[PDB]
Design a protein around this ligand. Sequence first.
Ligand SMILES: CC1=C(CCC(=O)O)c2cc3nc(cc4[nH]c(cc5[nH]c(cc1n2)c(C)c5CCC(=O)O)c(CCC(=O)O)c4C)C(CCC(=O)O)=C3C
Ligand SMILES: [Ca+2]
Length: 308
Amino acid sequence: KVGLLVMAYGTPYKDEDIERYYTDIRHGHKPSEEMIADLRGRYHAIGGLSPLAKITEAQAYGLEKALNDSQDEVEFKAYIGLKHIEPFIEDAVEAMHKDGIEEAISIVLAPHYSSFSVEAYNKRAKEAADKLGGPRINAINDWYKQPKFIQMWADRINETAKQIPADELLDTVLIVSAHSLPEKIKQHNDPYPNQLQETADFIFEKVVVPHYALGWQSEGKTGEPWLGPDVQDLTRELYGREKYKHFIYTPVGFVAEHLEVLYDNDYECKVVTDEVGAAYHRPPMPNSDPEFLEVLRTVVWEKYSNLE
Ligand SMILES: CC1=C(CCC(=O)O)c2cc3nc(cc4[nH]c(cc5[nH]c(cc1n2)c(C)c5CCC(=O)O)c(CCC(=O)O)c4C)C(CCC(=O)O)=C3C
Ligand SMILES: [Ca+2]
Protein backbone atom coordinates (compact mmCIF):
# COMPACT_ATOMS: atom_id res chain seq x y z
CA LYS A 1 0.00 0.00 0.00
CA VAL A 2 0.97 3.68 -0.34
CA GLY A 3 0.33 5.85 2.70
CA LEU A 4 -1.77 8.97 2.13
CA LEU A 5 -0.97 11.39 4.95
CA VAL A 6 -3.79 13.93 5.00
CA MET A 7 -3.10 16.91 7.25
CA ALA A 8 -5.19 19.72 8.70
CA TYR A 9 -5.25 22.09 11.63
CA GLY A 10 -7.49 20.22 14.07
CA THR A 11 -10.41 21.35 16.23
CA PRO A 12 -11.66 20.58 19.77
CA TYR A 13 -13.72 17.41 20.00
CA LYS A 14 -15.38 18.53 23.23
CA ASP A 15 -15.90 21.88 24.94
CA GLU A 16 -13.43 20.75 27.60
CA ASP A 17 -10.69 20.36 24.96
CA ILE A 18 -10.57 24.09 24.16
CA GLU A 19 -7.94 24.92 26.79
CA ARG A 20 -5.41 22.27 25.74
CA TYR A 21 -6.01 22.94 22.04
CA TYR A 22 -5.41 26.69 22.46
CA THR A 23 -2.31 25.94 24.53
CA ASP A 24 -0.95 23.77 21.72
CA ILE A 25 -1.59 26.58 19.23
CA ARG A 26 0.35 28.92 21.53
CA HIS A 27 3.38 26.57 21.53
CA GLY A 28 2.61 25.26 25.03
CA HIS A 29 2.08 28.67 26.65
CA LYS A 30 -1.28 28.48 28.38
CA PRO A 31 -3.67 31.27 27.35
CA SER A 32 -5.25 33.49 29.95
CA GLU A 33 -8.80 33.05 31.25
CA GLU A 34 -9.87 36.06 29.16
CA MET A 35 -8.32 34.61 25.99
CA ILE A 36 -9.96 31.24 26.62
CA ALA A 37 -13.33 32.91 27.26
CA ASP A 38 -13.08 34.84 23.99
CA LEU A 39 -12.39 31.67 21.98
CA ARG A 40 -15.03 29.63 23.80
CA GLY A 41 -17.47 32.46 23.10
CA ARG A 42 -16.77 32.24 19.38
CA TYR A 43 -17.26 28.46 19.39
CA HIS A 44 -20.51 29.03 21.29
CA ALA A 45 -21.65 31.61 18.73
CA ILE A 46 -21.38 29.09 15.86
CA GLY A 47 -23.35 26.43 17.77
CA GLY A 48 -20.95 25.07 20.41
CA LEU A 49 -18.22 23.29 18.44
CA SER A 50 -16.95 23.29 14.94
CA PRO A 51 -17.87 20.76 12.24
CA LEU A 52 -14.25 20.58 11.11
CA ALA A 53 -13.42 17.17 12.61
CA LYS A 54 -16.22 15.39 10.74
CA ILE A 55 -15.54 17.28 7.51
CA THR A 56 -11.80 16.55 7.65
CA GLU A 57 -12.57 12.84 8.08
CA ALA A 58 -14.96 12.91 5.14
CA GLN A 59 -12.33 14.65 3.02
CA ALA A 60 -9.53 12.24 3.92
CA TYR A 61 -11.54 9.03 3.54
CA GLY A 62 -13.43 10.38 0.52
CA LEU A 63 -10.07 11.09 -1.12
CA GLU A 64 -8.88 7.56 -0.27
CA LYS A 65 -11.98 6.13 -1.90
CA ALA A 66 -11.84 8.35 -4.98
CA LEU A 67 -8.24 7.25 -5.56
CA ASN A 68 -8.83 3.55 -4.98
CA ASP A 69 -12.02 3.45 -7.07
CA SER A 70 -10.31 5.04 -10.11
CA GLN A 71 -7.20 2.89 -10.68
CA ASP A 72 -5.64 -0.41 -9.67
CA GLU A 73 -1.93 0.39 -9.91
CA VAL A 74 -1.70 0.97 -6.14
CA GLU A 75 -3.76 0.84 -2.97
CA PHE A 76 -3.83 4.09 -0.98
CA LYS A 77 -4.48 4.11 2.75
CA ALA A 78 -5.36 7.40 4.43
CA TYR A 79 -3.90 8.52 7.77
CA ILE A 80 -5.14 11.78 9.29
CA GLY A 81 -2.49 13.92 10.95
CA LEU A 82 -3.52 17.12 12.71
CA LYS A 83 -1.48 20.12 13.71
CA HIS A 84 -2.89 20.91 17.16
CA ILE A 85 -4.88 17.96 18.58
CA GLU A 86 -4.78 14.17 18.38
CA PRO A 87 -4.32 12.36 16.11
CA PHE A 88 -1.26 14.54 15.65
CA ILE A 89 0.94 14.57 12.55
CA GLU A 90 3.43 12.55 14.56
CA ASP A 91 0.78 10.00 15.56
CA ALA A 92 -0.19 9.52 11.90
CA VAL A 93 3.41 8.88 10.84
CA GLU A 94 3.87 6.46 13.74
CA ALA A 95 0.75 4.58 12.58
CA MET A 96 2.04 4.28 9.01
CA HIS A 97 5.39 2.98 10.24
CA LYS A 98 3.71 0.46 12.55
CA ASP A 99 1.52 -0.75 9.67
CA GLY A 100 4.56 -1.38 7.46
CA ILE A 101 3.99 1.54 5.09
CA GLU A 102 7.22 2.15 3.17
CA GLU A 103 6.22 5.12 0.97
CA ALA A 104 3.68 7.87 1.55
CA ILE A 105 2.30 10.93 -0.21
CA SER A 106 1.27 13.84 1.98
CA ILE A 107 -1.25 16.61 1.30
CA VAL A 108 -2.36 19.52 3.48
CA LEU A 109 -6.04 20.54 3.36
CA ALA A 110 -5.02 24.15 2.48
CA PRO A 111 -4.17 24.78 -1.19
CA HIS A 112 -1.50 27.47 -0.61
CA TYR A 113 2.01 27.20 0.71
CA SER A 114 3.57 29.35 3.41
CA SER A 115 6.42 29.14 5.90
CA PHE A 116 3.90 29.18 8.80
CA SER A 117 1.50 26.60 7.45
CA VAL A 118 2.49 23.92 4.90
CA GLU A 119 6.21 24.25 5.70
CA ALA A 120 5.49 23.46 9.37
CA TYR A 121 3.27 20.48 8.53
CA ASN A 122 5.97 19.10 6.25
CA LYS A 123 8.83 19.62 8.73
CA ARG A 124 6.96 17.79 11.48
CA ALA A 125 6.00 14.89 9.22
CA LYS A 126 9.56 14.52 7.93
CA GLU A 127 11.11 14.76 11.39
CA ALA A 128 8.77 12.06 12.74
CA ALA A 129 9.53 9.76 9.79
CA ASP A 130 13.27 10.33 10.19
CA LYS A 131 13.19 9.26 13.84
CA LEU A 132 11.15 6.14 13.00
CA GLY A 133 13.09 5.06 9.90
CA GLY A 134 10.06 5.46 7.65
CA PRO A 135 7.92 5.84 5.71
CA ARG A 136 9.50 8.00 3.02
CA ILE A 137 7.14 10.98 2.78
CA ASN A 138 6.70 12.65 -0.61
CA ALA A 139 5.14 16.01 0.14
CA ILE A 140 2.74 18.09 -1.92
CA ASN A 141 3.44 21.76 -1.13
CA ASP A 142 0.50 23.49 -2.86
CA TRP A 143 -2.26 22.73 -5.31
CA TYR A 144 -4.14 26.00 -6.01
CA LYS A 145 -3.06 25.90 -9.69
CA GLN A 146 -5.14 22.77 -10.31
CA PRO A 147 -7.72 23.82 -12.94
CA LYS A 148 -10.50 21.85 -11.30
CA PHE A 149 -9.84 23.77 -8.07
CA ILE A 150 -10.22 27.14 -9.81
CA GLN A 151 -13.29 25.94 -11.72
CA MET A 152 -14.95 24.64 -8.55
CA TRP A 153 -14.78 28.05 -6.95
CA ALA A 154 -15.80 29.84 -10.13
CA ASP A 155 -18.84 27.55 -10.45
CA ARG A 156 -19.96 28.29 -6.88
CA ILE A 157 -19.48 32.03 -7.41
CA ASN A 158 -21.43 32.02 -10.69
CA GLU A 159 -24.28 30.06 -9.04
CA THR A 160 -24.56 32.75 -6.37
CA ALA A 161 -24.22 35.57 -8.88
CA LYS A 162 -27.01 34.21 -11.08
CA GLN A 163 -29.46 34.94 -8.23
CA ILE A 164 -28.39 38.63 -7.98
CA PRO A 165 -30.55 41.02 -10.04
CA ALA A 166 -28.84 41.75 -13.33
CA ASP A 167 -29.05 45.50 -12.73
CA GLU A 168 -27.15 44.99 -9.44
CA LEU A 169 -24.38 42.74 -10.75
CA LEU A 170 -22.43 45.85 -11.74
CA ASP A 171 -22.61 46.72 -8.02
CA THR A 172 -21.29 43.30 -6.87
CA VAL A 173 -17.76 42.53 -5.67
CA LEU A 174 -15.98 39.22 -5.04
CA ILE A 175 -13.79 39.23 -1.87
CA VAL A 176 -11.14 36.49 -2.10
CA SER A 177 -9.38 35.72 1.17
CA ALA A 178 -7.25 33.36 3.26
CA HIS A 179 -5.91 33.19 6.80
CA SER A 180 -3.65 36.17 7.48
CA LEU A 181 -0.03 35.69 8.53
CA PRO A 182 2.61 38.06 9.99
CA GLU A 183 3.55 40.68 7.39
CA LYS A 184 7.22 39.84 7.93
CA ILE A 185 6.90 36.78 5.66
CA LYS A 186 7.01 39.27 2.76
CA GLN A 187 10.54 40.25 3.79
CA HIS A 188 11.89 36.93 2.49
CA ASN A 189 9.62 36.47 -0.53
CA ASP A 190 7.41 33.81 1.02
CA PRO A 191 5.14 32.67 -1.84
CA TYR A 192 1.90 32.82 0.15
CA PRO A 193 0.70 36.38 -0.69
CA ASN A 194 1.42 35.90 -4.41
CA GLN A 195 -0.29 32.49 -4.46
CA LEU A 196 -3.45 34.06 -3.08
CA GLN A 197 -3.28 36.89 -5.63
CA GLU A 198 -2.84 34.36 -8.45
CA THR A 199 -5.79 32.36 -7.14
CA ALA A 200 -7.99 35.46 -7.04
CA ASP A 201 -6.91 36.43 -10.57
CA PHE A 202 -7.53 32.94 -11.98
CA ILE A 203 -11.00 32.79 -10.42
CA PHE A 204 -11.92 36.33 -11.48
CA GLU A 205 -11.40 35.59 -15.15
CA LYS A 206 -13.90 32.69 -14.94
CA VAL A 207 -16.79 34.45 -13.17
CA VAL A 208 -19.51 36.91 -14.17
CA VAL A 209 -18.83 39.18 -11.19
CA PRO A 210 -17.14 42.32 -12.58
CA HIS A 211 -15.29 43.49 -9.46
CA TYR A 212 -12.93 41.75 -7.06
CA ALA A 213 -10.45 42.35 -4.25
CA LEU A 214 -8.01 40.31 -2.19
CA GLY A 215 -8.24 40.42 1.59
CA TRP A 216 -7.10 38.45 4.63
CA GLN A 217 -8.82 37.24 7.78
CA SER A 218 -8.28 35.81 11.24
CA GLU A 219 -5.10 37.68 12.15
CA GLY A 220 -3.88 36.64 15.60
CA LYS A 221 -3.39 38.31 18.97
CA THR A 222 0.19 39.57 18.61
CA GLY A 223 2.10 42.86 18.70
CA GLU A 224 3.24 42.93 15.08
CA PRO A 225 1.71 43.72 11.68
CA TRP A 226 -0.17 41.01 9.79
CA LEU A 227 -1.10 40.71 6.11
CA GLY A 228 -3.97 42.96 5.17
CA PRO A 229 -6.35 44.40 4.45
CA ASP A 230 -8.55 42.48 6.84
CA VAL A 231 -11.80 41.50 5.14
CA GLN A 232 -13.90 43.59 7.56
CA ASP A 233 -11.80 46.70 6.93
CA LEU A 234 -11.76 46.03 3.15
CA THR A 235 -15.55 45.76 3.10
CA ARG A 236 -15.87 49.18 4.74
CA GLU A 237 -13.27 50.72 2.40
CA LEU A 238 -14.90 49.33 -0.76
CA TYR A 239 -18.38 50.42 0.31
CA GLY A 240 -16.94 53.84 1.05
CA ARG A 241 -15.42 54.20 -2.42
CA GLU A 242 -17.84 52.27 -4.66
CA LYS A 243 -21.14 51.74 -2.74
CA TYR A 244 -21.35 48.04 -3.67
CA LYS A 245 -24.74 46.42 -3.04
CA HIS A 246 -23.51 42.81 -2.85
CA PHE A 247 -20.36 41.33 -1.27
CA ILE A 248 -19.52 37.71 -2.14
CA TYR A 249 -16.93 36.19 0.22
CA THR A 250 -14.84 33.21 -0.93
CA PRO A 251 -12.19 32.38 1.70
CA VAL A 252 -10.39 30.14 -0.77
CA GLY A 253 -7.47 29.58 1.53
CA PHE A 254 -9.80 27.31 3.55
CA VAL A 255 -11.44 24.10 2.36
CA ALA A 256 -14.19 23.56 4.97
CA GLU A 257 -16.75 25.26 7.09
CA HIS A 258 -15.08 25.81 10.43
CA LEU A 259 -14.72 28.55 13.03
CA GLU A 260 -12.75 30.88 10.75
CA VAL A 261 -15.52 30.86 8.14
CA LEU A 262 -18.63 30.46 10.33
CA TYR A 263 -17.53 33.25 12.68
CA ASP A 264 -14.99 35.42 10.84
CA ASN A 265 -17.07 35.59 7.65
CA ASP A 266 -20.66 34.67 8.48
CA TYR A 267 -20.77 36.77 11.66
CA GLU A 268 -18.03 39.42 11.40
CA CYS A 269 -18.28 40.26 7.68
CA LYS A 270 -22.10 40.22 7.79
CA VAL A 271 -21.94 42.70 10.69
CA VAL A 272 -20.20 45.12 8.30
CA THR A 273 -22.46 44.49 5.31
CA ASP A 274 -25.45 45.00 7.61
CA GLU A 275 -23.97 48.28 8.89
CA VAL A 276 -23.48 49.71 5.40
CA GLY A 277 -26.74 48.34 3.98
CA ALA A 278 -25.32 45.75 1.54
CA ALA A 279 -26.16 42.08 1.03
CA TYR A 280 -23.91 39.31 2.35
CA HIS A 281 -23.14 36.21 0.27
CA ARG A 282 -20.79 33.36 1.18
CA PRO A 283 -20.93 30.35 -1.14
CA PRO A 284 -20.74 26.82 0.26
CA MET A 285 -17.26 25.67 1.19
CA PRO A 286 -15.75 22.65 -0.64
CA ASN A 287 -16.24 20.35 2.41
CA SER A 288 -16.52 16.77 1.02
CA ASP A 289 -18.39 17.65 -2.18
CA PRO A 290 -17.65 15.11 -4.96
CA GLU A 291 -16.21 17.91 -7.12
CA PHE A 292 -13.69 18.75 -4.39
CA LEU A 293 -12.79 15.10 -3.77
CA GLU A 294 -12.04 14.97 -7.53
CA VAL A 295 -9.72 17.98 -7.21
CA LEU A 296 -7.79 16.19 -4.46
CA ARG A 297 -7.78 12.90 -6.38
CA THR A 298 -6.26 14.64 -9.41
CA VAL A 299 -3.58 16.28 -7.25
CA VAL A 300 -2.54 13.10 -5.47
CA TRP A 301 -2.65 10.89 -8.56
CA GLU A 302 -0.48 13.36 -10.51
CA LYS A 303 1.97 13.40 -7.61
CA TYR A 304 2.13 9.61 -7.47
CA SER A 305 2.58 9.34 -11.24
CA ASN A 306 5.46 11.84 -11.15
CA LEU A 307 7.29 9.99 -8.37
CA GLU A 308 7.17 6.71 -10.28
C1 LIG B 1 -2.26 29.89 8.11
C2 LIG B 1 -3.30 29.31 9.02
C3 LIG B 1 -4.38 28.52 8.66
C4 LIG B 1 -4.74 28.03 7.28
C5 LIG B 1 -3.95 26.77 6.88
C6 LIG B 1 -4.26 25.50 7.66
O1 LIG B 1 -5.42 25.05 7.51
O2 LIG B 1 -3.37 24.98 8.41
C7 LIG B 1 -5.10 28.19 9.86
C8 LIG B 1 -6.27 27.44 10.01
C9 LIG B 1 -7.08 27.31 11.14
N1 LIG B 1 -6.92 28.00 12.30
C10 LIG B 1 -7.86 27.52 13.16
C11 LIG B 1 -8.01 27.97 14.47
C12 LIG B 1 -7.20 28.86 15.19
N2 LIG B 1 -6.03 29.42 14.75
C13 LIG B 1 -5.48 30.22 15.72
C14 LIG B 1 -4.29 30.93 15.61
C15 LIG B 1 -3.45 31.01 14.53
N3 LIG B 1 -3.70 30.41 13.32
C16 LIG B 1 -2.63 30.69 12.53
C17 LIG B 1 -2.47 30.28 11.21
C18 LIG B 1 -3.35 29.52 10.44
N4 LIG B 1 -4.46 28.88 10.91
C19 LIG B 1 -1.64 31.49 13.26
C20 LIG B 1 -0.32 31.93 12.72
C21 LIG B 1 -2.19 31.75 14.48
C22 LIG B 1 -1.64 32.59 15.59
C23 LIG B 1 -1.01 31.76 16.68
C24 LIG B 1 -0.59 32.62 17.87
O3 LIG B 1 -1.44 33.36 18.39
O4 LIG B 1 0.60 32.55 18.24
C25 LIG B 1 -6.35 30.13 16.86
C26 LIG B 1 -6.13 30.83 18.17
C27 LIG B 1 -7.05 32.02 18.42
C28 LIG B 1 -7.06 33.07 17.33
O5 LIG B 1 -5.98 33.49 16.88
O6 LIG B 1 -8.19 33.48 16.96
C29 LIG B 1 -7.38 29.30 16.54
C30 LIG B 1 -8.55 28.88 17.39
C31 LIG B 1 -8.63 26.46 12.54
C32 LIG B 1 -9.65 25.62 13.23
C33 LIG B 1 -10.98 26.30 13.37
C34 LIG B 1 -11.99 25.42 14.10
O7 LIG B 1 -11.70 24.92 15.23
O8 LIG B 1 -13.05 25.24 13.51
C35 LIG B 1 -8.19 26.38 11.25
C36 LIG B 1 -8.66 25.45 10.17
CA1 LIG C 1 -10.43 37.61 15.15
